[PDB]
Amino acid sequence: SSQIRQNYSTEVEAAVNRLVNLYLRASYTYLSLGFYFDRDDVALEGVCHFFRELAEEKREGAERLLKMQNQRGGRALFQDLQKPSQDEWGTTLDAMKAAIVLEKSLNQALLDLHALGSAQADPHLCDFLESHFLDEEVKLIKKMGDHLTNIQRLVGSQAGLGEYLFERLTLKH
Amino acid sequence: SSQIRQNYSTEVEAAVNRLVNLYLRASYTYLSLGFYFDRDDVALEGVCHFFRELAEEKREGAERLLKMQNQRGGRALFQDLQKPSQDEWGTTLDAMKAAIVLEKSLNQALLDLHALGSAQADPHLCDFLESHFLDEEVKLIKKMGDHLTNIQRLVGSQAGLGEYLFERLTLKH
Amino acid sequence: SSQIRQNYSTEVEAAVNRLVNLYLRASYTYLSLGFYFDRDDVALEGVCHFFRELAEEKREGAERLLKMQNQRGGRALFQDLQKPSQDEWGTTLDAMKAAIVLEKSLNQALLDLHALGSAQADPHLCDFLESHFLDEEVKLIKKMGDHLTNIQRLVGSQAGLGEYLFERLTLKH
Amino acid sequence: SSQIRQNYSTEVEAAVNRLVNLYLRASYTYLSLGFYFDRDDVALEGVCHFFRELAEEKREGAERLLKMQNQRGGRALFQDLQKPSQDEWGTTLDAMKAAIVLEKSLNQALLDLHALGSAQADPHLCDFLESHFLDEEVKLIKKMGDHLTNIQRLVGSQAGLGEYLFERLTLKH
Ligand SMILES: [Cl-]
Numbered sequence: 001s002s003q004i005r006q007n008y009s010t011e012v013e014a015a016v017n018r019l020v021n022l023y024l025r026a027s028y029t030y031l032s033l034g035f036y037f038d039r040d041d042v043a044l045e046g047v048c049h050f051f052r053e054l055a056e057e058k059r060e061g062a063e064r065l066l067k068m069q070n071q072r073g074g075r076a077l078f079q080d081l082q083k084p085s086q087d088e089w090g091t092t093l094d095a096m097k098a099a100i101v102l103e104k105s106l107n108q109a110l111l112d113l114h115a116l117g118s119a120q121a122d123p124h125l126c127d128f129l130e131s132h133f134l135d136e137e138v139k140l141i142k143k144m145g146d147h148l149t150n151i152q153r154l155v156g157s158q159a160g161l162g163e164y165l166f167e168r169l170t171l172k173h
Numbered sequence: 174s175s176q177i178r179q180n181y182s183t184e185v186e187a188a189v190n191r192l193v194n195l196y197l198r199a200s201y202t203y204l205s206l207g208f209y210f211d212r213d214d215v216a217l218e219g220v221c222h223f224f225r226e227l228a229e230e231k232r233e234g235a236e237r238l239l240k241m242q243n244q245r246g247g248r249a250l251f252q253d254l255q256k257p258s259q260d261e262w263g264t265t266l267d268a269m270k271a272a273i274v275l276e277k278s279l280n281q282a283l284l285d286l287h288a289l290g291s292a293q294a295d296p297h298l299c300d301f302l303e304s305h306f307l308d309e310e311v312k313l314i315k316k317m318g319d320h321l322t323n324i325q326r327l328v329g330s331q332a333g334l335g336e337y338l339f340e341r342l343t344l345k346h
Numbered sequence: 347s348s349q350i351r352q353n354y355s356t357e358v359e360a361a362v363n364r365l366v367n368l369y370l371r372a373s374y375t376y377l378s379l380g381f382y383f384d385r386d387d388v389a390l391e392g393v394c395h396f397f398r399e400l401a402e403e404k405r406e407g408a409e410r411l412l413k414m415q416n417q418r419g420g421r422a423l424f425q426d427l428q429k430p431s432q433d434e435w436g437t438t439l440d441a442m443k444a445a446i447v448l449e450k451s452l453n454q455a456l457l458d459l460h461a462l463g464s465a466q467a468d469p470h471l472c473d474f475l476e477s478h479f480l481d482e483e484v485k486l487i488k489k490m491g492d493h494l495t496n497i498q499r500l501v502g503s504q505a506g507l508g509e510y511l512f513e514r515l516t517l518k519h
Numbered sequence: 520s521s522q523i524r525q526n527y528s529t530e531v532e533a534a535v536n537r538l539v540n541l542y543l544r545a546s547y548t549y550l551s552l553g554f555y556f557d558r559d560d561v562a563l564e565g566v567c568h569f570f571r572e573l574a575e576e577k578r579e580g581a582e583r584l585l586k587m588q589n590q591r592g593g594r595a596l597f598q599d600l601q602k603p604s605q606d607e608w609g610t611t612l613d614a615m616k617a618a619i620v621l622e623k624s625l626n627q628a629l630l631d632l633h634a635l636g637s638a639q640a641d642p643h644l645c646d647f648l649e650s651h652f653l654d655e656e657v658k659l660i661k662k663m664g665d666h667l668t669n670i671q672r673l674v675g676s677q678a679g680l681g682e683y684l685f686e687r688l689t690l691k692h
C-alpha cells in the first residue's frame with residue numbers, strides 16, 4: 001500500500017478513475033470516427049486526420065490522469081470500455097456535432113471533479129486540472145465551434161461541394 | 174536453352190507471358206487516357222499527370238515480370254498489343270470508373286496466377302506476387318476508390334465546377 | 347458501400363474486426379500492467395517502461411489492421427473493450443508469465459486468421475499477416491521467454507534482490 | 520513602510536515567515552544528512568549527493584518565498600534555525616524514512632497556507648503555491664516513496680549488499 005498518500009480523498013481517487021474511463025472512451029470514439037472517414041465510400045482525409053489526432057490527445061489525457069493518480073498514492077482501477085455510440089457517423093457536420101457533444105460532456109466531468117477537489121480542499125488536484133485540462137478543453141471546443149460554423153455556412157444548396165471544400169481548405173491533409 | 178530452370182512449370186511460364194501482355198495493354202490504355210486529358214478541349218493537367226504516372230507504373234510491372242521470367246529460366250514471348258477500348262474517355266468520372274474496372278481485371282489476373290502458383294507448389298512465384306504486386310494493387314484501387322467518391326460528391330448540379338475543383342485541389346499539378 | 351472490395355470474404359472481414367478487439371484488449375492490459383509497476387509501493391521503472399511500450403505496440407497493430415480493413419473495402423466494427431483480467435499483477439515474474447500467455451493467445455489468433463485466409467484463397471491477407479505480424483510476434487515471444495528465464499534464475503533465495511537487479515541491469519530505464 | 524501592499528493579510532505574512540523558517544530548517548537537516556553519508560565510515564556517495572541536492576532545493580524554496588514576501592509588501596522576519604533532530608542518521612532506509620516524514624510535514628504546511636490564502640481570498644498567494652511548490656512537493660514525495668520501496672525490497676537477509684547496490688545502481692554518482 002502507499003507510504004506517500006496525503007490529502008487525497010477516496011472520493012477524488014474514484015472520480016479520477018471514472019474520468020480515465022471517460023477519456024479512454026472518448027479516445028475510442030475518435031478512433032472509430034477517424035476510420036469511418038478513411039472508408040473508400042467516404043474518403044475525407046482531412047476529417048480522418050482530425051479525429052485520429054483527437055484519439056491520440058484523449059489517450060494522452062488519460063495517461064496523464066493515471067500518472068497523477070500514482071503520484072498521489074491512489075490506485076488506478078480500470079473498467080470495461082464501452083463501444084462508441086454509432087457504427088457510422090453520417091456527414092462531416094453530423095460528426096463535428098457529435099464531437100462537440102462529447103467534448104462538452106468531458107468538460108462537464110472536469111468541472112465536476114474540480115468542484116469536488118475544491119470542496120475537499122485538494123489544491124494539487126485543482127491545480128492539475130487547471131494546468132493540463134481546463135484551458136486545453138476550452139480551446140478545443142472553440143476550434144470545433146469554429147469548424148461547425150464553417151461547415152454550416154457551406155451546406156447551402158450544394159452539400160457535396162461544401163463538404164469537399166471544407167476538407168480541402170480548412171482541415172490539414 | 175536454360176541450365177537453371179527448376180520447379181518452374183510451363184503453365185506458370187505461359188501465364189506470366191500473358192500477364193506481361195495485360196500489364197503492357199494497361200500501360201497503353203493509360204498512355205491514351207493521359208493524352209486525352211492533355212487535349213486543349215479537355216485541359217485537366219492533374220488528371221493527365223495521374224494517368225501518365227500509371228502508364229509508367231504498369232510498364233514497370235511488366236518489366237519486373239519479364240526480369241523474373243528470365244531469372245526462373247522461362248522464355249519471354251510477346252504478342253500483339255491491342256489498342257485501348259476507347260479513343261475518347263468522357264469525363265474525369267468516366268475515366269476513373271474505367272481505370273477501376275481495368276485495375277480490378279489486373280488484380281484478378283494476379284490472384285489467378287497466385288492460385289496457379291500455389292497449386293503447382295511454386296513458392297517463389299507466390300512470394301514474388303505478394304512482395305511486388307498484390308499490396309501495390311490493393312493500395313492503388315483504394316486510392317482510385319477514394320478519388321471516385323470525391324469526384325461523385327462534386328457532381329451535384331454544377332458538374333464543370335466540380336471537375337475543375339477536383340483536378341485543382343486533389344490531383345498533383 | 348464499397349466500390350473496391352474484391353476477393354475479401356465476410357468471414358475474413360469479421361475475423362479482422364475480432365482481431366482488432368483482441369489487440370486493443372491486449373493494449374489495455376499492458377496499460378494496466380505499466381501503471382501497476384509505476385505504483386510507489388512497486389516502483390520498478392524498467393518493468394513499467396517495458397509494458398507501456400507494449401501497450402503502444404499493440405495499439406499500433408490494431409491501427410494497421412483497421413487500415414487494411416479499409417484498404418480491402420471491409421467495414422470496421424468496434425465492440426466493448428473488456429477490462430484486464432487483474433487489477434494487481436503480482437511480481438515481475440507473475441507479470442511476465444501473464445504477458446507470455448497473452449502473447450501466445452494473440453499469436454494463435456494470427457495463425458487462425460492466416461489459416462482462414464489460406465482456405466479462402468486470400469493471398470493479400472496472408473501476406474499482410476506474414477509481413478507485419480507473424481515474425482514480430484515470434485520475436486516478442488522469444489524476448490519474453492529470454493526475460494522469464496533470467497527472472498527465474500534470479501529468484502533463488504533472495505527474491506527482492508533478484509527483482510531489483512533484473513529491473514536495473516536487463517530492462518531499459 | 521510599503522506603498523505597494525494590497526490584499527495581503529497580516530496572517531498570511533506571518534505564515535509566510537514561518538514557512539521560510541521551515542524550509543531553512545529542512546535545508547539544514549539535509550545538509551547534515553548529506554555530510555553524514557560522506558563520512559569515511561558510512562561512505563555512500565550517491566546518498567550524500569541526493570541529500571546535498573535537497574539541501575539546495577529547500578534553500579531555493581525559502582528564497583522564492585522571501586522574494587514573494589517582498590513583492591507583496593510584507594516584511595521578512597527571521598528566527599533562530601533549530602539544529603536537525605539527529606546527529607547520526609542510521610541506514611539509508613532510516614534516512615529516507617526521516618526525509619519522507621520531513622517532506623510530509625512541509626507539504627502539510629504548504630496545504631495549511633493554501634487554505635489560509637483561500638479563506639482570506641488571496642488568489643496570488645494560492646497561485647504562487649500551486650505554481651512553484653505543491654506539484655514539486657508531490658513529485659519529490661513520489662520519488663522518495665519509490666526509493667523507499669526499492670531500499671525495502673533490497674534489505675532481505677543481506678543488508679550491506681542491498682545498501683551498496685541501491686547506492687550504486689539507483690542513485691546518481
Ligand atoms: Cl467486469
Ligand SMILES: [Cl-]
Pocket residue numbers: 253
Ligand atoms: Cl502475330
Ligand SMILES: [Cl-]
Pocket residue numbers: 083426
Ligand atoms: Cl453494446
Ligand SMILES: [Cl-]
Pocket residue numbers: 599
Ligand atoms: Cl532570539
